[PDB]
Design a protein around this ligand. Structure first.
Ligand code: ATP
Ligand code: ATP
Ligand code: ATP
Ligand code: ATP
Ligand code: ATP
Ligand code: ATP
Ligand code: MG
Ligand code: MG
Ligand code: MG
Ligand code: MG
Ligand code: MG
Ligand code: MG
Ligand code: MG
Ligand code: MG
Lengths: 309, 309, 309, 309, 309, 309
């Protein structure tokens, strides 16, 4: 079986970058809409006996992109692909991972069930909002981390990184920032709201680096940055793997004191970058390409958790 | 267990009509979108031990509405509803019911699988594009027919119906028109394309009635009507259960010779009716309400196949 | 994994032809009946790690043959075959593919479920009565077409084929005849019953060729042929992939005006050919052998939809 | 939900007896064959919301009857029956319950899987060949025993039963005979083959009673009876729940020394009784009717293991 | 269907308390071990058609108790119980809810799968370690909260509760303490380790109340209490729903400065209470009994999230 | 894919012997207990794309070992092993293979379901208590036999084996002893209890060899040996594949007249051998190693049923 990479319509540039890193052309697929807006999918080449990877991020018109992904998986499965892998850099509905007191769906579990029944044998994703989502599946799920690329960016872009501070915006994700601070051998200052915020960790005259899994409306990072600037930090950075930037996010970032808002390209960023000068993108296509290549070859994927390829 | 009717966002007016016919209020549900356009669903009342019916048609923004339906089903299922029934008047992706020579998905089967894995115990739908779709499910599926309401409309609106002709637009659905002609005791003239059309059945100086399951772009019925008017029919009617009317449909209908284009209200029609004077709507809410009531009470549903309630 | 071909008891000659075309011997299997008429199956050679193909058509004693097929699949699956494929040239219960108004089983879906639970990983079949049956499965289904062999027969056996007409007997299957007429570049005359029949398409002084998926009691083709001979066709042919010929079929064919009734050998025909001189058989063993070989080698199967091997 | 009893074609008289004991009429069902010998099933009354019991024994044309049962279950399940129970007095393929050294199917497990996928929620059967077959299902299985009726027959028909001996024909089923002997407070003599047979237990000048689950070819009981008559037993009886009597069974029984061969009516016996004067039938319709009634009412079924109703 | 409560061997006193609150006797069940230490289960009364609740906490010999629970569920399911509910006050393997960088099982998901395949239709549990565990199931899961009982205890046992502080021991569970502080209208001071600890929130001359889901080795609460006593808190309390208290826990509690260590009785505490004077128990049997009663009657369970019955 | 052998904690020496025979090192795995006695499993090497075999016998602390096996299977499955095989020399809960009149679990079926849902693709076991257990699975199960090794031991250790007698202790397993006697060409004397025992087959002045699948409390073999010594057998041997030896077994063996009690090493025997001088062990690691090697290479496993490797 050979690797076949197919792109959904959500993130074409990322799929092309992945395909170039693998020395492959993107598989021929027609992904459009019928007149009544139903998804139309046509696999333009035989996938019989091949190892198929479908790249689609949970961004943009999320329900359309998710339906397209499921329809593509189904088309490849009934076309006798030997294995079908969904490469989902940003997992849709990941924030609906529990009920907790409300008569609400667990939408992430529903998405996992739909991916399974569509025929996915394997999932590759990056920085799941909650790693318990891996347990929503019965098929293997490789949850990659942007952390090696983030560490590389910090070392090559922040001159005072040895004295900086790594700040979690909410108490929930402080595990990520502790791992990053341990890797950099720095202090991890913490922030949480009580309309007021409380911060532990000396930030005065230092650089503070907010790290989080995603920025949707940027309410979380803007409040944290306001707090940090209250406590005398010389500069504040925000680093996120998923740059969703919906709603009022671009205006809030423009009016905030961030030196830089760095995101990975798990979601296309060109349109947002046009309207916001302080957004910078870390390419993670090498990590995804290496994960695809290693799953195909039976090589260790977890080696990527700590190594930039 | 009591009947609880919940409406999705696709067809609120139909759900309200159904609820009024059952003497019930619509269940409290919040169905909206998060900032990043992910579906947000919140069941506003306990459904524990209840017989839940969720009304959502495959129309409008089809992928959003389908996701909303699946999320609502999941929310009701994990909220310990005794039974969950999807009331889907127009089944989405019904026209993708086979591959036939192409490397294509069977999207209708995927939709059936998704509805099943979401937790639906029962499906109620109207005039499935292909009744083989019933076999795509392992749960019971009640496929209702608009034919009794169509016959009622014909008898009360076409003065010359005893001399009229019932015409199938494509060879595929001529079964429907034969059943209708047998019920009315009239001739069924047939039409199919060879850019030219061929018609069997005397239509001269008579009324011809085109009957079909749906009109999407109205290419099918406009070509058939052109043929019929070539052969001297005094008036031509089109009657359809599903009035999708996407793309150039309204302009084609406006420029065509139809005396009337009658559709059921399985899909909301007010916006289309604003731009097209010859569209008339048959209310089928009584049929859906009776089906819901009979499934709840253990009464015969097939009795509705031949009786207007 | 190597190809292993096993024959059920239904069509031994077809299985042998397939095995010869693949350069293989039929696998050792004992398929008989216990005293109380329960099916007895004994796999006479190890199939561990092999790619197993079981050839059984839905003909003869259909329930016995279907049980035998399921039992063989189960025996091969629990004997650790790497993959089990049911090669079912004529799919049993294919005509019970829907309910449509009656309190009836969808027997084709039940058969698909039984094949799946027995352990079949893949289905190869020819000219399914309804291609929606492919959606009754969750495993891949390769639905082969007799059309290339039919076109070859027409070109090599009917001297006036460039002027002939391709006639559908019922409105349902006219898609097949349109494809054939497009391939031959001829007119497709159509027939359907109203005890009287209506025909469109000049057949006078021409050869008419009825094409259909199967002839069971031959009521369908005999009525169509009577109509065609009413309209002056010089000769009438019938061509079918599945020659079931049950009940009064042989007598009706003998008393009908067919120049020839051509069937494929998806069903054994020698006994019927003894009693009916106008039955001729097209061998489709090359198509089935090529499909088996291509699925085994990961080669394109759809290439066979348009090419005679 | 009300009880609905449907009969398959295998054992109509038993189904009628069961229905009379329940004070019910048999449900309207058409169970016949199409021209090509495919099973045709038509449920003649609504079963929506009802508790459906389908009576079909694994006898006669076993594969036809099994297919008919599965098709009926499927028809009732997709007709929205609240619960479907297969009442299978003699379970087909029960003797193929293991492989043991051979490359053979476990056909009983396949049958269980097929019954489950057809939609059966519950199985009622009598004297399974191996009670481990209950573990082949994931749905509940009530395995009834003919033993109370057998004990009643022994007490009312064998004058010397207090001095008799209960003999197992093969070592496998001696558990049944020990239970019977314990109930009667008598000795259980045992027999097994070494073309010679060995017997333990004084049988001289006594009545010996062979007890077994079934008599198929009667090779087992005729050999055992020959042995018993060698050792001076005044009379020999055979008692079996399942009287299959296939092959040479009737001739062997006619030429054997049995005083009586008693069977239950889990299988119709009239035709066999015509050709064999020493066959007598125990009616077990009361046990099956009580089991149906108790499962419907939520009453203890195991109470029937020791009580004649 | 009637309620039947069965106790596993893990927590007999809790099951008895639940049964008394429901006005029921515990169902007759034999739960012991064979000589080779395999679990032996015997249901001593018919459960046919009943609503069965099996009470077993994930404590003590956890693997034995989990096996016993699964075996009991299986026994009740194949005995035709109408519904089987696992009442698991402390969910076993809840802390293995993710992999996160290691080649480790997701044991909680495995436990959920095992409970589902054993036949559980419903799960009732209290204070799941991660509420995402609800998404590990496809059956409904009611995750009850000890918070109402905790609030009642605080108000009736701590005289200065209006001035107290609610402290989370680890950053992960601070959601619980924020909910509790909001209910009490007090400040929530937070603690996390950097062998040193950092605390935000004035605790000087006040009572601090540590709240957490469980105390296993009490390393978490003892370190937090040491920190709190460093910052001048007059008294420190610990309140936990699950008092596992394994390993060195009792000695650490005895040597720590806790005024009180309060636990619920989701786990039996008498043996631990013998060796530790500062352990007090909150009875939560009323909450579990109300949940059982409300699920049985189709009443709202979420009403218990905020109301002490 | 390469073979990876992992050992559970139950039988480390057997796993090492198997690994040596395959020329492999045991895979790195940490299998221990958390403080609260929950199983902790950590796979110390990548198994991605490998053929994983996990060796764990149903002995010792059976519930702990079974949980450990399931957790290891789950860890390997979600770590993307190409195939996972449970090598279970002594299958736990095998004696609970049926209900038979009691409201009891079928625990063996539950264990099979748990192994399947954990992710096992294949089971290798030795001398299942009932071979019907193979039908409890839907995955392939290779049930190996100790008989070739037993025959080898008999020929090399009992000088009078040509005149010996092979005795079944209970009527149930006499099939094993008939196969052994046929292989050795000797008589098979049989024993069963009526507190008294009955024996057929001349044993006077001969060696009697009891053969059975397992000895748990040794009540079965000690009673049989007492009977045999009553009838003048010069020596009595017992040979068993599974030496469980729980409860009073060692004392009964010490006080019994056995010349030797031979067991295989499907269960560790060193501790029991310390306290009982007449226990001897047959190594079956070559049979298990050959089965693993042959399943990996696609070679015939059934060849081992009659051949010592
Ligand atoms: N796409 C979405 N956009 C915004 N909010 C969402 C979205 N999906 C779910 N939510 C809601 O957001 C909330 C989840 O918030 P969040 O993940 O930030 O915190 P948490 O899960 O409570 O805690 P933490 O992640 O810190 O452990 C829920 O109320 C959920 O319904
Ligand atoms: N939403 C859609 N809008 C338009 N075309 C669609 C849609 N979904 C599927 N199709 C395409 O339309 C075609 C199906 O057309 P249609 O149902 O009219 O005819 P058919 O299935 O070939 O025959 P018939 O229904 O007459 O038996 C397929 O090529 C399918 O891919
Ligand atoms: N083996 C069989 N022999 C005869 N009739 C059968 C068989 N199996 C099913 N039928 C019946 O035949 C009918 C199906 O007929 P047929 O397939 O010719 O037409 P259709 O499905 O209505 O339309 P079309 O195939 O033209 O789209 C149904 O009433 C079905 O119950
Ligand atoms: N319908 C059938 N008629 C005859 N033989 C059958 C039938 N089905 C299976 N068999 C075969 O009969 C044998 C099973 O025989 P039987 O049930 O009498 O003994 P057993 O299972 O070996 O032992 P026991 O039942 O005494 O414990 C197997 O070889 C099986 O393949
Ligand atoms: N029974 C157990 N006893 C002790 N440790 C366990 C047990 N089960 C799992 N663990 C381990 O404990 C760790 C989980 O710790 P914990 O739940 O306290 O923190 P977390 O999940 O990392 O974060 P948080 O719960 O604060 O969001 C994992 O390494 C897991 O393997
Ligand atoms: N681990 C165990 N230890 C002891 N007894 C057990 C164990 N598991 C199950 N049992 C019980 O042992 C009995 C099964 O006994 P056994 O297997 O010796 O005979 P059988 O199945 O009745 O007949 P046979 O195996 O001779 O055909 C059942 O009552 C079962 O509940
Ligand atoms: Mg967050
Ligand atoms: Mg159409
Ligand atoms: Mg046809
Ligand atoms: Mg048997
Ligand atoms: Mg027998
Ligand atoms: Mg914690
Ligand atoms: Mg046993
Ligand atoms: Mg035994």
């Amino acid at each position: 079986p050979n690797i076949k990479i197919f792109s959904g319509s959500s993130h074409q540039d990322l799929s092309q970058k992945i395909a170039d890193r693998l020395g492959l052309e993107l598989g021929k697929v027609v992904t459009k809409k019928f007149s009544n807006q139903e998804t139309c999918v046509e696999i333009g080449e035989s996938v019989r006996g091949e190892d198929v990877y479908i790249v689609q991020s949970g961004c943009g018109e999320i329900n359309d992109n998710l339906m397209e992904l499921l329809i593509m998986i189904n088309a490849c499965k009934i076309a006798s692909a030997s294995r079908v892998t969904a490469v989902i850099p940003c997992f849709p509905y990941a924030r609906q991972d529990k009920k907790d007191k409300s008569r609400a769906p667990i939408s992430a579990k529903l998405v996992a069930n739909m991916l399974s029944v569509a025929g996915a044998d394997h999932i590759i994703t990056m920085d799941l909002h909650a790693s318990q989502i891996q347990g929503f599946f019965d098929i293997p799920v490789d949850n990659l981390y942007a952390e090696p690329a983030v560490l590389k960016w910090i070392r090559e872009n922040i001159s005072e990184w040895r004295n900086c501070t790594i700040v979690s915006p909410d108490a929930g994700g402080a595990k990520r920032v502790t791992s990053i601070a341990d890797r950099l051998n720095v202090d991890f200052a913490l922030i949480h709201k009580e309309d007021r915020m409380v911060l532990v960790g000396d930030v005065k005259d230092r650089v503070a680096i907010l790290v989080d899994d995603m920025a949707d409306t940027c309410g979380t990072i803007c409040h944290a940055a306001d707090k940090l600037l209250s406590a005398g930090a010389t500069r504040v950075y925000a680093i996120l793997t998923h740059g969703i930037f919906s709603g009022p996010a671009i205006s809030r970032i423009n009016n905030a004191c961030f030196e830089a808002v760095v995101v990975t390209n798990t979601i296309p960023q060109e349109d947002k970058m046009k309207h916001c000068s302080k957004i910078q993108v870390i390419d993670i296509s090498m990590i995804l390409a290496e994960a695809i290549r290693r799953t195909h070859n039976g090589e260790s994927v977890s080696y990527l958790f700590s190594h930039v390829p």
